[PDB]
Design an enzyme around this catalytic site. Structure first.
Site, PDB file in Angstrom:
ATOM      1  N   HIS A  40       0.822  -1.222   0.000  1.00 57.08           N
ATOM      2  CA  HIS A  40       0.000   0.000   0.000  1.00 57.08           C
ATOM      3  C   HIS A  40       0.851   1.265   0.000  1.00 57.08           C
ATOM      4  CE1 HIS A  40       0.313  -0.328   4.494  1.00 57.08           C
ATOM      5  NE2 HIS A  40       0.319   0.980   4.408  1.00 57.08           N
ATOM      6  N   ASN A  54      17.498  12.411  11.731  1.00 60.05           N
ATOM      7  CA  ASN A  54      16.583  13.535  11.585  1.00 60.05           C
ATOM      8  C   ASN A  54      16.157  13.642  10.129  1.00 60.05           C
ATOM      9  OD1 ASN A  54      15.349  16.136  11.294  1.00 60.05           O
ATOM     10  ND2 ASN A  54      16.493  16.845  13.057  1.00 60.05           N
ATOM     11  N   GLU A  62      23.558  10.583   5.079  1.00 66.12           N
ATOM     12  CA  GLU A  62      22.475  10.178   4.221  1.00 66.12           C
ATOM     13  C   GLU A  62      22.948   9.715   2.871  1.00 66.12           C
ATOM     14  OE1 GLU A  62      22.644  13.298   5.541  1.00 66.12           O
ATOM     15  OE2 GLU A  62      20.862  13.619   6.743  1.00 66.12           O
ATOM     16  N   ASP A  84       0.415  -7.837   1.659  1.00 62.84           N
ATOM     17  CA  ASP A  84       0.805  -6.431   1.703  1.00 62.84           C
ATOM     18  C   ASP A  84       2.319  -6.302   1.792  1.00 62.84           C
ATOM     19  OD1 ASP A  84       0.670  -3.659   1.774  1.00 62.84           O
ATOM     20  OD2 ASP A  84      -0.095  -3.551   3.821  1.00 62.84           O
ATOM     21  N   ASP A 171       2.065   1.374  19.890  1.00 63.61           N
ATOM     22  CA  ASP A 171       1.674   0.877  18.564  1.00 63.61           C
ATOM     23  C   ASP A 171       2.410   1.613  17.475  1.00 63.61           C
ATOM     24  OD1 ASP A 171       0.077  -0.600  16.671  1.00 63.61           O
ATOM     25  OD2 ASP A 171      -1.749   0.595  17.162  1.00 63.61           O
ATOM     26  N   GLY A 175       2.486   6.834   8.962  1.00 65.99           N
ATOM     27  CA  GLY A 175       3.855   7.132   8.625  1.00 65.99           C
ATOM     28  C   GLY A 175       4.852   6.031   8.939  1.00 65.99           C
ATOM     29  N   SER A 177       4.088   2.728   8.152  1.00 64.21           N
ATOM     30  CA  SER A 177       3.864   1.663   7.189  1.00 64.21           C
ATOM     31  C   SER A 177       5.073   1.327   6.363  1.00 64.21           C
ATOM     32  CB  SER A 177       2.725   2.000   6.199  1.00 64.21           C
ATOM     33  OG  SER A 177       1.497   1.651   6.727  1.00 64.21           O
ATOM     34  N   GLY A 178       5.244   0.035   6.103  1.00 52.49           N
ATOM     35  CA  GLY A 178       6.332  -0.428   5.275  1.00 52.49           C
ATOM     36  C   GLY A 178       7.583  -0.712   6.043  1.00 52.49           C
TER      37      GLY A 178
HETATM   38 CA   LIG Z   1      18.727  13.735   7.728  1.00 50.04          CA
END
Ligand SMILES: [Ca+2]
Lengths: 223, 57
Positions: A40, A54, A62, A84, A171, A175, A177-178
């Protein structure tokens, strides 16, 4: 993630962010060219962001790499949510290092009560909305299929499991998901769906990765 | 019942996907968080699509 804690920068080095001009889903790096996420979470034009802590700042570790393929399971059912799972191929291989690392696929399924680590940049409130800058983590147990079916009658397939706390408060949320559910160093789940976030009697539901290991390996090798 | 008048529906999946819905109280297409599955019809990928379908509801 509701009821969790700040992971610490790059302590979950297999966690990626899926970006379409903003963070919309998580994923898990399984080799230098491939990520596992939820079906999804499919979008065209995904950018995978690796080495993030962050996600609203450029901090120095990154790697931003476009998807070259985003392959949804051929039997994904967008009404029942069965199957899924999605595989994303990176347009170039990630450079693996201490902050960007793959997670192993399972060799067998995990049992009820096994403690796992769930992570993501999703909402941290059960009521209302607060999205974190840095990665959040939660320890939670896998729950029995019987309890999962009792929580969600008629909705749990053999390719889903529940994890969390029936009292509420902890839980995955929008945001997340996956993203990964890792148990004893193996990727056992993908954040999939739930009913609200962190509500009593409504644990999170996760794609059962151990059922897809042969499919994942063969699909990656065929692409 | 006019689908353009229904409140926006996040649904059960756990994505944070920004979509548009027509807000009849405000008279404009507005953003909301869609969880990625089980969309209702007051859910558009762009403001232009929302305005075309629902504007003036
Ligand atoms: Ca960053």
């Amino acid at each position: 993630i509701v009821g969790g804690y700040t992971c610490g920068a790059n302590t979950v080095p297999y966690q990626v962010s899926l970006n379409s001009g903003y963070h919309f889903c998580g994923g898990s790096l399984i080799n230098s060219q491939w990520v596992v996420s939820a079906a999804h979470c499919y979008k065209s034009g995904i950018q995978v962001r690796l080495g993030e802590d962050n996600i609203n700042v450029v901090e120095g570790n990154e790697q931003f790499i476009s998807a070259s393929k985003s392959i949804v399971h051929p039997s994904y059912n967008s009404n029942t949510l069965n199957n899924d799972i999605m595989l994303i191929k990176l347009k170039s291989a990630a450079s693996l290092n201490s902050r960007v690392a793959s997670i192993s696929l399972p060799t067998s399924c995990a049992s009820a009560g096994t403690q796992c680590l769930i992570s993501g940049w999703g909402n941290t409130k059960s009521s209302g909305t607060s999205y974190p800058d840095v990665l959040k983590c939660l320890k939670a147990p896998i729950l029995s299929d019987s309890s999962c079916k009792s929580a969600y009658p008629g909705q749990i397939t053999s390719n889903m499991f529940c994890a969390g706390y029936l009292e509420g408060g902890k839980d995955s949320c929008q945001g997340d998901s996956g993203g990964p559910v890792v148990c004893s160093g193996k990727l056992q789940g993908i954040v999939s769906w739930g009913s609200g976030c962190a509500q009593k009697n409504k644990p999170g539901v996760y794609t059962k990765v151990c059922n897809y290991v042969s499919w994942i390996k063969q699909t990656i090798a065929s692409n | 019942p006019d689908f353009c008048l229904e409140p926006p529906y996040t649904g059960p999946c756990x994505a944070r996907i920004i979509r548009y819905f027509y807000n009849a109280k405000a008279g404009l297409c507005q953003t909301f968080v869609y969880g990625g599955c089980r969309a209702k019809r007051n859910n558009f990928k762009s403001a232009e699509d929302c305005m075309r379908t629902c504007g003036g509801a």
